[PDB]
A and B are shown apart, each in its own frame.
Chain A
Amino acid sequence: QLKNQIRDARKACADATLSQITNNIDPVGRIQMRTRRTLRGHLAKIYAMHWGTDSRLLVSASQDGKLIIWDSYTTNKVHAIPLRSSWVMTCAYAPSGNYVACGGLDNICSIYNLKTREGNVRVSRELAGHTGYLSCCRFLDDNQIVTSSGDTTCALWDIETGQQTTTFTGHTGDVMSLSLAPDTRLFVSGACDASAKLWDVREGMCRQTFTGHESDINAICFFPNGNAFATGSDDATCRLFDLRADQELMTYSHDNIICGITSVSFSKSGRLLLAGYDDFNCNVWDALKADRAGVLAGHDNRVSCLGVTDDGMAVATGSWDSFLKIWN
């Protein structure tokens, strides 16, 4: 049917490999990153983190019963908000920094207003309606939020009205992560069916699908340009997809690596792809030559999550222990 036509069009479009095109440029030399700052306030396993717009305050969520906002410059803590449910697997930071959203196994990711007249953080809104565990809910805007659950559907809510403004369906497996494009008009969503889809919140329906992985895509990212993105699954491979090509571009795999991917992030210029792993190692792959620029092994159990600041001045990683590290 149409699948054969799509495959034929994709094959016809591909004429030159990315490795052949990018072999002319010089390879990226080895880079060493050291733990400038370490955070030890947490008492349990952390599962998510996010960076603020100012690239100074970062949020972190764990099962100790609260989520903590840390000032990376001085390592001091400015907020520690207790959670109604200990099981939390996602925390997000609003672009303005006024609100913080977090959710977990319960089908609710709630938003708390950091800035209050009385100076005390209070719960602002609780969103309910999902039929599965929250995977990753991110702040699209101060007025609208995006939620990903395990019921193979995604949602877009209005904070003030507190209802599902838009619903996205079509995924077969459980959705694991989403990433928002810089223009705040497009986003990607990877499911457990070894597939990813592209959705625009303006229309409310899918745009294009991407496949090729042999496992469950648990990490997704987006290129700073916005015309490409990266995915990481349990098959110890990272795949780069292009929106305008609708096909894979590079595969970041090695014989040594057997463990899956836990988190995937891109640098400021999109030249370095930081990928987490279950062997407490983070690999800085080359986004154009698929070369291991560096390996960070400062963690103990496994890199639960990792992120890059807005200005790209540091890379902050959190592991399955109560440890948070900031490199460069």
Chain B
Amino acid sequence: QLKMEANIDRIKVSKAAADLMAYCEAHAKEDPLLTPVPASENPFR
């Protein structure tokens, strides 16, 4: 298990953080939890 675990492709943590931030901001406008949903059109009301 250790032999295959050691031989893996490990990217820089900065690139992973940048990708995570880009994914978070790209879908930020599509999150009803972040942006306050209007009372209308809301199924739960």
A residues whose Cβ falls under 8 Å from a Cβ of B: 1-3, 5-6, 9-10, 13-16, 18, 21-22, 25, 28, 31, 36-37, 56, 72-73, 170, 205-209, 223-225, 227-228, 242, 244-247, 249, 267-272, 287-288, 308, 311-315, 326, 328
Given B6, B13, B28, B43, which contacts A14 in the complex, CB threshold below 8 Å? B13
Task: Looking at the assembled complex, report how far the CB atom of A266 sits from the nearest CB atom of chain B, in whole angstroms.
Answer: 10
Are the C-beta atoms of B31 and A269 separated by less than 8 Å? Answer: yes
**With A245-B11, A312-B31 in contact, is A209–B44 under 8 Å at CB?**
no
Are the C-beta atoms of A312 and B20 separated by less than 8 Å? Answer: no
Q: Interface size class for chain B?
A: 35 or more
Contact with A along B3-45 (1 / 0, CB 8 A): 1111011111111111111011111101111100100001111
Cβ–Cβ < 8 Å partners of B15 in chain A: 244
Task: Looking at the assembled complex, report how far the CB atom of B9 sits from the nearest CB atom of chain A, in whole angstroms.
Answer: 8
Cβ–Cβ < 8 Å partners of B16 in chain A: 227-228, 242, 244-245, 249
Give the complex CA separation of A13 and B19 in angstroms: 16
Given B6, B13, B30, B33, which contacts A5 in the complex, CB threshold below 8 Å? B6
Are the C-beta atoms of B31 and A271 separated by less than 8 Å? Answer: yes
Task: Looking at the assembled complex, report how far the CB atom of A34 sits from the nearest CB atom of chain B, in whole angstroms.
Answer: 10
Q: Is the interface of A mostly helix, strand, loop or mixed?
A: loop
Give the complex CA separation of A56 and B44 in angstroms: 10
Are the C-beta atoms of B5 and A208 separated by less than 8 Å? Answer: yes
Are the C-beta atoms of B18 and A227 separated by less than 8 Å? Answer: no
Are the C-beta atoms of A313 and B5 separated by less than 8 Å? Answer: no
Identify 15 new A-B residue pairs, CB closer than 8 A, beyond the known A36-B45, A205-B4, A225-B20: A6-B6, A13-B11, A21-B18, A22-B17, A25-B25, A36-B44, A206-B5, A242-B16, A245-B11, A269-B24, A269-B26, A270-B27, A272-B33, A287-B24, A312-B32
Are the C-beta atoms of B42 and A313 separated by less than 8 Å? Answer: yes
Q: Which residue of A lies closest to B17 (CB)?
A: A21
Are the C-beta atoms of A271 and B44 separated by less than 8 Å? Answer: no
Are the C-beta atoms of A6 and B44 separated by less than 8 Å? Answer: no
Cβ–Cβ < 8 Å partners of B23 in chain A: 223-225, 269-270
Would you give 23 A-B contacts (Cβ < 8 Å), ordered by A? Answer: A2-B6, A6-B2, A6-B6, A14-B13, A16-B14, A18-B13, A36-B45, A37-B44, A56-B43, A73-B43, A208-B5, A224-B23, A227-B20, A242-B13, A244-B9, A246-B8, A249-B17, A269-B34, A272-B31, A288-B20, A312-B33, A315-B33, A328-B37
Give the complex CA separation of A269 and B27 in angstroms: 5
Give the complex CA separation of A104 and B45 in angstroms: 35
Give the complex CA separation of A267 and B28 in angstroms: 10
9 closest A-B pairs by CB: A269-B27, A269-B31, A2-B2, A36-B44, A244-B11, A225-B23, A21-B17, A2-B6, A242-B16
Are the C-beta atoms of B13 and A247 separated by less than 8 Å? Answer: yes
Task: Looking at the assembled complex, report how far the CB atom of A85 sits from the nearest CB atom of chain B, in whole angstroms.
Answer: 33
